[PDB]
PDB file of all heavy atoms in Angstrom:
ATOM      1  N   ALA A  22      -0.171  10.633  -3.435  1.00 20.70           N
ATOM      2  CA  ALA A  22       0.541  11.957  -3.345  1.00 20.70           C
ATOM      3  C   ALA A  22      -0.527  13.081  -3.542  1.00 20.70           C
ATOM      4  O   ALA A  22      -1.506  12.906  -4.264  1.00 20.70           O
ATOM      5  CB  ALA A  22       1.603  12.070  -4.411  1.00 20.70           C
ATOM      6  N   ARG A  84      23.853   7.510  11.460  1.00 13.87           N
ATOM      7  CA  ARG A  84      23.390   6.178  11.141  1.00 13.87           C
ATOM      8  C   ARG A  84      24.485   5.178  11.500  1.00 13.87           C
ATOM      9  O   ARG A  84      25.643   5.366  11.152  1.00 13.87           O
ATOM     10  CB  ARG A  84      23.034   6.078   9.637  1.00 13.87           C
ATOM     11  CG  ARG A  84      22.140   7.185   9.147  1.00 13.87           C
ATOM     12  CD  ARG A  84      20.982   6.648   8.316  1.00 13.87           C
ATOM     13  NE  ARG A  84      19.834   6.317   9.148  1.00 13.87           N
ATOM     14  CZ  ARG A  84      18.877   7.204   9.439  1.00 13.87           C
ATOM     15  NH1 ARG A  84      18.900   8.459   9.021  1.00 13.87           N
ATOM     16  NH2 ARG A  84      17.826   6.824  10.187  1.00 13.87           N
ATOM     17  N   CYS A  88      28.772   9.139  11.282  1.00 12.71           N
ATOM     18  CA  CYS A  88      28.222  10.309  10.672  1.00 12.71           C
ATOM     19  C   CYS A  88      28.214  10.047   9.134  1.00 12.71           C
ATOM     20  O   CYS A  88      29.316   9.933   8.544  1.00 12.71           O
ATOM     21  CB  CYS A  88      29.037  11.568  10.966  1.00 12.71           C
ATOM     22  SG  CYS A  88      29.300  11.842  12.741  1.00 12.71           S
ATOM     23  N   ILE A  92      24.703  13.796  -0.254  1.00  8.84           N
ATOM     24  CA  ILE A  92      24.857  15.035  -0.999  1.00  8.84           C
ATOM     25  C   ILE A  92      24.020  14.925  -2.265  1.00  8.84           C
ATOM     26  O   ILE A  92      24.116  13.977  -2.991  1.00  8.84           O
ATOM     27  CB  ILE A  92      26.329  15.331  -1.322  1.00  8.84           C
ATOM     28  CG1 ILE A  92      27.168  15.375  -0.018  1.00  8.84           C
ATOM     29  CG2 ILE A  92      26.475  16.595  -2.075  1.00  8.84           C
ATOM     30  CD1 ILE A  92      28.602  15.009  -0.232  1.00  8.84           C
ATOM     31  N   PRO A  97      17.256  24.818  -9.684  1.00 15.32           N
ATOM     32  CA  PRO A  97      16.026  25.631  -9.635  1.00 15.32           C
ATOM     33  C   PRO A  97      15.027  25.259 -10.692  1.00 15.32           C
ATOM     34  O   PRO A  97      15.369  24.951 -11.820  1.00 15.32           O
ATOM     35  CB  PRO A  97      16.581  27.081  -9.811  1.00 15.32           C
ATOM     36  CG  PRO A  97      18.002  26.962  -9.362  1.00 15.32           C
ATOM     37  CD  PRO A  97      18.479  25.632  -9.792  1.00 15.32           C
ATOM     38  N   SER A 139       9.181   6.831  -8.644  1.00 31.96           N
ATOM     39  CA  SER A 139      10.096   5.775  -9.140  1.00 31.96           C
ATOM     40  C   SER A 139       9.284   4.485  -9.239  1.00 31.96           C
ATOM     41  O   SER A 139       8.553   4.135  -8.311  1.00 31.96           O
ATOM     42  CB  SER A 139      11.293   5.575  -8.186  1.00 31.96           C
ATOM     43  OG  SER A 139      11.058   4.463  -7.323  1.00 31.96           O
TER      44      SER A 139
END
Side-chain angles (χ1 to χ4, degrees):
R84 312 227 89 89
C88 309
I92 303 155
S139 99

